[PDB]
Coordinates of C-alpha atoms in Angstrom, one line a residue:
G1 CA -60.8 18.8 -59.1
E2 CA -60.3 16.5 -62.1
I3 CA -59.6 16.7 -65.6
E4 CA -62.3 14.7 -67.4
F5 CA -61.1 15.3 -71.0
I6 CA -58.1 16.5 -72.9
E7 CA -57.2 16.4 -76.6
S8 CA -55.3 18.4 -79.1
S9 CA -56.7 21.9 -79.8
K10 CA -56.5 21.4 -83.4
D11 CA -59.0 18.7 -83.4
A12 CA -61.6 21.0 -82.1
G13 CA -60.8 24.1 -84.3
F14 CA -58.8 26.0 -81.4
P15 CA -55.6 27.6 -82.6
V16 CA -52.5 27.0 -80.5
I17 CA -52.0 29.4 -77.5
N18 CA -48.5 31.1 -77.9
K19 CA -38.4 31.7 -71.4
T20 CA -38.8 33.4 -67.9
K21 CA -38.9 37.3 -67.6
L22 CA -37.0 36.7 -64.5
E23 CA -33.2 37.6 -64.6
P24 CA -30.7 38.0 -61.8
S25 CA -30.6 41.5 -60.6
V26 CA -27.4 43.5 -59.8
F27 CA -28.2 42.3 -56.1
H28 CA -27.9 38.9 -57.1
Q29 CA -24.3 38.2 -55.6
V30 CA -24.7 40.8 -52.7
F31 CA -27.4 38.7 -51.0
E32 CA -28.0 34.9 -50.7
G33 CA -30.8 32.8 -51.8
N34 CA -32.0 29.6 -53.3
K35 CA -35.0 30.3 -55.3
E36 CA -35.1 30.3 -59.2
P37 CA -37.7 30.9 -62.0
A38 CA -40.3 28.2 -62.0
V39 CA -40.0 25.8 -64.9
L40 CA -41.9 27.2 -67.9
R41 CA -41.1 24.6 -70.6
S42 CA -40.8 20.7 -70.9
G43 CA -37.2 21.0 -71.9
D44 CA -35.8 22.7 -68.9
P45 CA -32.5 21.3 -68.0
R46 CA -33.2 21.5 -64.4
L47 CA -36.4 19.2 -64.5
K48 CA -36.2 16.0 -62.6
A49 CA -39.8 15.0 -63.5
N50 CA -42.1 15.1 -66.3
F51 CA -43.3 18.8 -66.7
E52 CA -46.9 18.2 -68.1
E53 CA -47.5 15.7 -65.6
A54 CA -46.3 17.8 -62.9
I55 CA -48.4 21.0 -63.5
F56 CA -51.5 19.2 -63.8
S57 CA -51.0 16.7 -60.7
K58 CA -52.9 19.3 -58.4
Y59 CA -56.2 17.9 -60.0
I60 CA -56.0 15.2 -57.3
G61 CA -59.8 14.3 -58.0
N62 CA -63.2 14.7 -56.4
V63 CA -65.0 13.3 -53.7
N64 CA -68.6 12.9 -55.0
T65 CA -70.8 13.6 -51.9
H66 CA -74.2 15.5 -51.1
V67 CA -74.1 18.7 -49.2
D68 CA -74.3 16.9 -45.8
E69 CA -75.9 17.9 -42.6
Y70 CA -72.5 19.6 -41.2
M71 CA -72.2 21.7 -44.5
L72 CA -75.6 22.8 -44.0
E73 CA -75.0 24.1 -40.5
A74 CA -71.8 25.6 -41.5
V75 CA -73.3 27.5 -44.5
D76 CA -76.1 28.7 -42.1
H77 CA -73.7 29.9 -39.5
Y78 CA -71.5 31.7 -42.0
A79 CA -74.4 33.3 -43.8
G80 CA -75.7 34.7 -40.6
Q81 CA -72.5 36.6 -40.5
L82 CA -72.5 37.9 -43.8
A83 CA -76.0 39.0 -43.5
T84 CA -75.0 42.0 -41.1
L85 CA -72.8 43.4 -44.0
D86 CA -75.9 44.2 -46.1
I87 CA -74.2 43.0 -49.2
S88 CA -76.0 44.5 -52.3
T89 CA -76.7 41.8 -54.9
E90 CA -77.8 44.4 -57.5
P91 CA -75.5 44.4 -60.6
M92 CA -72.5 47.0 -60.3
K93 CA -72.6 49.6 -62.9
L94 CA -70.5 48.7 -65.9
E95 CA -68.2 51.8 -65.6
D96 CA -67.6 51.2 -61.9
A97 CA -67.0 47.4 -62.5
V98 CA -64.5 48.3 -65.3
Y99 CA -62.7 51.3 -64.6
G100 CA -62.6 51.6 -60.7
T101 CA -64.8 52.4 -57.7
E102 CA -63.9 52.4 -54.0
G103 CA -63.5 49.0 -52.9
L104 CA -62.6 47.4 -56.3
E105 CA -59.7 48.6 -58.3
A106 CA -60.1 49.0 -61.9
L107 CA -59.7 45.9 -64.3
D108 CA -56.0 45.2 -64.8
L109 CA -55.4 46.4 -68.5
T110 CA -51.8 44.6 -68.6
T111 CA -53.1 40.9 -68.2
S112 CA -54.5 38.7 -70.7
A113 CA -57.8 39.4 -72.5
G114 CA -58.2 35.6 -72.7
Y115 CA -60.2 33.9 -75.5
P116 CA -61.0 34.6 -78.3
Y117 CA -58.8 38.0 -78.1
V118 CA -55.5 36.3 -77.6
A119 CA -56.1 34.3 -80.8
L120 CA -57.0 37.4 -82.6
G121 CA -54.1 39.6 -81.3
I122 CA -56.5 41.9 -79.7
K123 CA -55.1 43.3 -76.2
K124 CA -57.2 44.7 -73.2
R125 CA -55.9 48.2 -74.2
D126 CA -57.4 47.8 -77.7
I127 CA -60.8 47.6 -76.1
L128 CA -60.5 49.7 -73.0
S129 CA -59.0 53.1 -72.2
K130 CA -58.1 54.5 -68.8
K131 CA -58.2 58.0 -70.0
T132 CA -61.6 58.0 -71.7
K133 CA -63.3 55.2 -69.9
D134 CA -64.9 54.2 -73.2
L135 CA -67.3 51.4 -72.8
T136 CA -68.4 51.2 -76.5
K137 CA -65.8 48.8 -77.8
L138 CA -66.4 46.5 -74.7
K139 CA -70.1 46.4 -75.4
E140 CA -69.5 45.4 -79.0
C141 CA -67.1 42.7 -78.0
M142 CA -69.5 41.4 -75.2
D143 CA -72.5 41.2 -77.5
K144 CA -70.3 39.6 -80.2
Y145 CA -68.8 37.0 -78.6
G146 CA -71.1 36.4 -75.5
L147 CA -70.2 34.6 -72.1
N148 CA -69.1 31.2 -70.8
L149 CA -66.1 31.1 -73.1
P150 CA -62.8 28.9 -72.7
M151 CA -60.6 30.0 -70.0
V152 CA -56.7 30.3 -71.2
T153 CA -54.1 28.5 -68.9
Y154 CA -50.9 29.9 -68.4
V155 CA -47.8 28.7 -66.3
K156 CA -47.0 31.1 -63.5
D157 CA -43.6 33.1 -64.1
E158 CA -42.3 33.5 -60.4
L159 CA -39.5 32.2 -58.2
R160 CA -39.7 28.7 -56.6
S161 CA -37.7 26.5 -54.3
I162 CA -35.2 24.2 -55.4
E163 CA -37.4 21.2 -54.8
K164 CA -40.3 22.7 -56.9
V165 CA -38.2 23.5 -59.7
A166 CA -36.9 20.1 -60.0
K167 CA -40.3 18.6 -59.5
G168 CA -41.7 20.7 -62.2
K169 CA -44.4 21.7 -59.9
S170 CA -45.1 25.2 -61.4
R171 CA -48.4 26.9 -60.6
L172 CA -51.1 27.5 -63.2
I173 CA -53.2 30.6 -63.6
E174 CA -56.2 31.0 -65.7
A175 CA -57.2 33.9 -67.7
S176 CA -61.0 34.3 -68.0
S177 CA -62.1 35.9 -71.2
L178 CA -62.5 39.8 -70.8
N179 CA -66.2 39.2 -71.5
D180 CA -66.4 36.7 -68.6
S181 CA -64.3 38.9 -66.3
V182 CA -66.4 41.9 -66.8
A183 CA -69.9 40.0 -66.4
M184 CA -68.5 38.6 -63.3
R185 CA -67.4 42.0 -61.9
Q186 CA -70.9 43.3 -62.6
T187 CA -72.7 40.2 -61.0
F188 CA -70.6 40.1 -57.8
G189 CA -68.7 43.6 -57.8
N190 CA -70.7 44.8 -54.7
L191 CA -69.9 41.6 -52.9
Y192 CA -66.1 42.1 -53.8
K193 CA -66.4 45.7 -52.7
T194 CA -68.0 44.8 -49.4
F195 CA -65.2 42.1 -48.7
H196 CA -62.3 44.4 -49.7
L197 CA -63.6 47.0 -47.4
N198 CA -64.2 44.8 -44.4
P199 CA -61.3 42.4 -43.6
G200 CA -61.6 40.7 -40.6
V201 CA -64.0 38.0 -38.6
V202 CA -67.2 39.2 -40.2
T203 CA -66.3 38.6 -43.7
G204 CA -63.9 36.1 -42.4
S205 CA -61.6 37.3 -45.3
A206 CA -58.2 39.5 -45.5
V207 CA -58.5 39.6 -49.1
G208 CA -57.5 43.2 -50.1
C209 CA -55.9 44.0 -46.5
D210 CA -53.0 46.3 -45.8
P211 CA -50.8 44.3 -43.3
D212 CA -49.2 47.4 -41.9
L213 CA -52.8 48.3 -40.5
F214 CA -54.6 44.9 -40.2
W215 CA -52.0 43.1 -38.1
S216 CA -52.8 45.1 -35.1
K217 CA -56.5 44.2 -35.4
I218 CA -55.8 40.6 -35.8
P219 CA -55.2 39.8 -32.1
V220 CA -57.9 42.0 -30.9
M221 CA -60.4 39.8 -33.3
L222 CA -58.6 36.3 -32.4
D223 CA -58.6 36.5 -28.7
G224 CA -58.8 32.7 -27.7
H225 CA -56.5 29.8 -28.3
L226 CA -55.0 30.1 -31.9
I227 CA -55.8 27.7 -34.6
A228 CA -53.7 28.1 -37.9
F229 CA -53.1 26.2 -41.1
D230 CA -52.9 26.3 -44.9
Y231 CA -53.4 23.6 -47.4
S232 CA -51.4 21.8 -50.3
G233 CA -53.0 22.5 -53.5
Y234 CA -56.3 24.1 -52.2
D235 CA -57.7 25.4 -55.4
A236 CA -57.4 22.3 -57.6
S237 CA -58.3 20.1 -54.7
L238 CA -61.9 21.5 -54.3
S239 CA -64.6 19.2 -55.2
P240 CA -68.1 20.2 -56.7
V241 CA -69.8 19.8 -53.5
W242 CA -67.9 22.8 -52.0
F243 CA -69.1 24.9 -55.0
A244 CA -72.7 23.8 -54.1
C245 CA -72.1 25.1 -50.8
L246 CA -71.0 28.2 -52.2
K247 CA -74.1 28.6 -54.2
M248 CA -76.2 28.0 -51.2
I249 CA -74.5 30.7 -49.3
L250 CA -74.8 33.3 -52.1
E251 CA -78.6 32.4 -52.6
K252 CA -78.9 32.9 -48.8
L253 CA -77.5 36.4 -49.3
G254 CA -80.3 37.2 -52.1
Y255 CA -78.5 36.1 -55.4
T256 CA -81.0 34.4 -57.6
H257 CA -80.3 30.9 -59.0
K258 CA -79.5 32.7 -62.4
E259 CA -76.8 34.9 -60.8
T260 CA -75.1 31.8 -59.3
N261 CA -74.7 30.2 -62.5
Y262 CA -71.3 31.9 -62.7
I263 CA -70.2 29.5 -60.0
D264 CA -70.9 26.7 -62.4
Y265 CA -68.7 28.3 -64.9
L266 CA -65.9 28.4 -62.1
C267 CA -66.4 24.8 -61.3
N268 CA -67.0 22.9 -64.6
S269 CA -64.6 24.8 -66.8
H270 CA -63.1 24.6 -70.2
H271 CA -59.4 25.5 -70.9
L272 CA -56.9 26.1 -73.6
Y273 CA -53.4 25.2 -72.7
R274 CA -50.8 25.7 -75.6
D275 CA -51.6 23.2 -78.1
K276 CA -54.3 21.4 -76.0
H277 CA -57.8 21.9 -74.6
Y278 CA -59.4 20.2 -71.8
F279 CA -62.5 20.2 -69.3
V280 CA -62.3 20.3 -65.6
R281 CA -64.9 19.3 -63.1
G282 CA -64.2 20.9 -59.7
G283 CA -61.2 23.0 -58.7
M284 CA -61.2 26.7 -58.4
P285 CA -59.7 28.1 -61.5
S286 CA -57.1 30.4 -59.8
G287 CA -56.9 33.8 -61.7
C288 CA -60.6 34.1 -62.8
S289 CA -62.7 37.0 -61.3
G290 CA -63.3 36.7 -57.6
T291 CA -61.3 33.6 -57.3
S292 CA -59.5 34.7 -53.8
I293 CA -62.6 36.0 -52.3
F294 CA -64.6 32.6 -53.4
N295 CA -61.7 30.6 -52.0
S296 CA -61.9 32.5 -48.7
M297 CA -65.8 32.1 -48.4
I298 CA -65.4 28.4 -49.2
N299 CA -62.8 28.1 -46.6
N300 CA -65.0 29.6 -44.1
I301 CA -67.7 27.0 -44.9
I302 CA -65.0 24.1 -44.8
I303 CA -63.6 24.9 -41.3
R304 CA -67.1 25.3 -39.9
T305 CA -68.0 22.0 -41.5
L306 CA -64.9 20.2 -40.0
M307 CA -65.4 21.6 -36.7
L308 CA -69.1 20.6 -36.4
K309 CA -68.2 17.1 -37.7
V310 CA -65.4 16.4 -35.2
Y311 CA -66.5 18.3 -32.2
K312 CA -70.0 17.7 -31.8
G313 CA -71.2 20.5 -29.5
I314 CA -68.8 23.1 -30.7
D315 CA -70.3 26.8 -30.4
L316 CA -69.6 28.2 -33.7
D317 CA -70.6 31.6 -32.0
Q318 CA -67.4 31.7 -30.2
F319 CA -65.4 30.5 -33.1
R320 CA -63.5 33.3 -35.1
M321 CA -61.5 33.1 -38.2
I322 CA -59.8 35.0 -41.1
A323 CA -58.9 33.3 -44.6
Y324 CA -57.0 34.6 -47.5
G325 CA -57.7 31.6 -50.0
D326 CA -56.4 28.4 -48.3
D327 CA -54.4 30.5 -45.6
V328 CA -56.3 30.6 -42.1
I329 CA -55.7 32.0 -38.9
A330 CA -58.5 31.5 -36.3
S331 CA -59.4 31.1 -32.6
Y332 CA -61.7 29.4 -30.3
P333 CA -61.8 29.7 -26.3
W334 CA -60.8 26.0 -25.9
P335 CA -58.1 24.0 -27.4
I336 CA -58.8 22.5 -30.8
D337 CA -56.7 19.7 -32.4
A338 CA -56.0 20.9 -35.8
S339 CA -54.7 17.5 -37.0
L340 CA -58.1 16.0 -36.3
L341 CA -59.6 18.7 -38.3
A342 CA -57.0 18.0 -41.0
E343 CA -57.9 14.1 -41.1
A344 CA -61.5 14.8 -41.3
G345 CA -60.8 17.1 -44.4
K346 CA -59.0 14.3 -46.2
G347 CA -62.3 12.8 -46.4
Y348 CA -63.7 15.7 -48.2
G349 CA -60.9 15.7 -50.7
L350 CA -58.7 18.4 -48.9
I351 CA -55.2 18.3 -48.0
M352 CA -54.8 20.5 -45.0
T353 CA -51.5 21.2 -43.4
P354 CA -51.8 22.7 -39.8
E355 CA -48.6 24.8 -29.9
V356 CA -49.7 27.7 -32.1
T357 CA -48.8 30.9 -30.3
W358 CA -48.6 34.7 -31.2
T359 CA -44.7 34.0 -31.4
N360 CA -44.8 31.3 -34.1
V361 CA -48.0 31.8 -35.9
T362 CA -47.9 32.9 -39.5
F363 CA -50.4 34.5 -42.0
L364 CA -49.8 35.8 -45.4
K365 CA -46.3 34.2 -44.8
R366 CA -45.7 36.9 -42.2
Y367 CA -45.2 36.7 -38.3
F368 CA -46.7 38.9 -35.7
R369 CA -44.5 40.9 -33.4
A370 CA -45.9 43.4 -31.0
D371 CA -44.0 46.7 -30.8
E372 CA -41.7 47.1 -28.1
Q373 CA -42.7 50.7 -27.2
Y374 CA -46.6 50.7 -28.3
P375 CA -47.6 47.1 -27.3
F376 CA -51.1 47.5 -29.0
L377 CA -49.5 48.0 -32.3
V378 CA -48.1 44.8 -34.1
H379 CA -45.5 44.4 -36.9
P380 CA -46.3 42.3 -39.7
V381 CA -42.9 40.3 -40.1
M382 CA -41.9 39.1 -43.5
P383 CA -38.7 37.0 -42.9
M384 CA -35.5 38.6 -44.2
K385 CA -34.7 35.4 -46.1
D386 CA -37.8 36.0 -48.3
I387 CA -36.9 39.8 -48.9
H388 CA -33.4 38.6 -50.0
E389 CA -35.0 36.0 -52.2
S390 CA -36.9 38.8 -54.1
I391 CA -34.3 41.3 -54.4
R392 CA -31.9 39.0 -56.2
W393 CA -34.2 38.8 -59.3
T394 CA -36.1 41.3 -61.5
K395 CA -38.5 41.0 -64.3
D396 CA -37.6 44.7 -65.4
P397 CA -34.6 46.5 -63.8
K398 CA -36.3 49.8 -64.9
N399 CA -38.5 49.1 -61.9
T400 CA -35.6 48.8 -59.7
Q401 CA -36.5 51.8 -57.5
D402 CA -40.0 50.8 -56.9
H403 CA -39.0 47.1 -56.3
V404 CA -36.5 48.1 -53.6
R405 CA -38.6 50.7 -52.0
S406 CA -41.4 48.0 -51.5
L407 CA -38.7 45.6 -49.9
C408 CA -37.9 48.3 -47.6
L409 CA -41.4 48.7 -46.3
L410 CA -41.4 45.0 -45.5
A411 CA -38.0 44.9 -44.1
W412 CA -37.9 47.4 -41.4
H413 CA -40.5 45.5 -39.3
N414 CA -37.6 43.1 -38.7
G415 CA -35.9 45.7 -36.7
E416 CA -33.3 48.5 -36.9
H417 CA -30.2 46.3 -36.9
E418 CA -31.7 44.2 -39.7
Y419 CA -32.6 47.2 -41.6
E420 CA -29.6 48.8 -41.5
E421 CA -27.6 45.6 -42.6
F422 CA -30.1 45.4 -45.4
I423 CA -29.6 49.1 -46.6
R424 CA -25.7 48.7 -46.2
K425 CA -25.7 45.6 -48.6
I426 CA -28.0 47.4 -51.1
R427 CA -25.6 50.3 -50.9
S428 CA -22.6 47.8 -51.9
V429 CA -23.6 48.0 -55.4
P430 CA -23.5 51.4 -57.1
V431 CA -27.2 51.1 -58.1
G432 CA -27.9 51.1 -54.5
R433 CA -26.5 54.5 -54.0
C434 CA -28.7 55.8 -56.8
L435 CA -31.8 54.8 -54.9
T436 CA -34.0 57.0 -52.7
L437 CA -34.2 54.7 -49.9
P438 CA -36.4 55.6 -46.7
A439 CA -34.7 56.0 -43.3
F440 CA -35.7 53.5 -40.6
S441 CA -36.9 56.5 -38.5
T442 CA -39.0 57.6 -41.4
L443 CA -40.7 54.2 -41.9
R444 CA -41.2 53.9 -38.1
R445 CA -42.6 57.4 -37.8
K446 CA -45.1 57.2 -40.8
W447 CA -46.2 53.7 -39.6
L448 CA -47.1 54.9 -36.0
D449 CA -48.8 57.9 -37.6
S450 CA -50.8 55.9 -39.9
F451 CA -53.0 54.7 -37.0
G452 CA -54.1 58.2 -36.2
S453 CA -56.5 58.8 -38.9
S454 CA -59.1 57.3 -41.1

């Protein structure tokens, strides 16, 4: 992706789009950590770099190439897999696409409504209602403002490492207009549903998975020599050729050329950021509808392309992979040099970052540890250091109970000794003794029982 044009918003008649919410929690001194809130403003005294330059530096440019022979075969192979899922290309019913259905959670009512709503002070809840499932106001707004509206760029308010704070390398997220979010959920909602209900090696996707259950399935699906990597700045690195590949895959699934027009909206985009507006060619605009699923689909095309290009004579029918956006875990029955693939990826404008074993591999920032007693069940193991980083901050201490409960559900997979120490430190602050904390044995019993029914 590349910014092709940027100028002051006022020159085009756009109004300007309006500190961190993260604050030290009561556990900030009880646990150790290094992370701090990402820089959100240019004047931040922790900066050791130019902020505006840093946040846009992920748009490293485009490789301008045609869909080549390797891509075509990659698209064909992945399309053959997805065909077995019988994805419906029929529009999803508006009420289902907006207010929830199996496999597609209701539209988030707390996030930005995007443009022009943010300029008018109109929030999602001024338009939508969970209680009534009203679609009348939404139809009025969609008729009135139409589709293909500018995206609103926000800086992601989240904890980051010391290096990323100093370098100002905060992440950006895009808010699609409510109109475009809804229209994309109508167009692709059945694809979203099918992906969410089928994480694994047919979709090649883990989007929507529950690691507590899914991690025991992964080694069954990936039974060869492991291949694993992620990327640096995946979304913004994507060149338009990969979006062309995605459109080809979607059309092989039965979408019409008009239904794939929304991929052009994602690829060639118009953004408002504070007092500026700018146009981008290429790049997945992270935070629009479907971006994790579409990133994952593109990654399935990319890895197959690279394998076909480097390993002539590869047999993709024996290849297996699972992607969550840029994050990949995969296998092949023979060893594969991931560094060769990564260098081949550099020629396509990608920055891939690769002896991978079940002991040292990670996926979704978690390790894999087979249960000592039930060896066919696999613990997802979030490192305790990451749990410690999280518990030390909060965006709203009114949610402390839910926050600490969620961390307990992650922590116990590290073993009973680690868990008891975690609980002891939590209880060394008075808030900690006011919380309902699950017992290790309860967490373990419920986990074991969860595999017994579905």
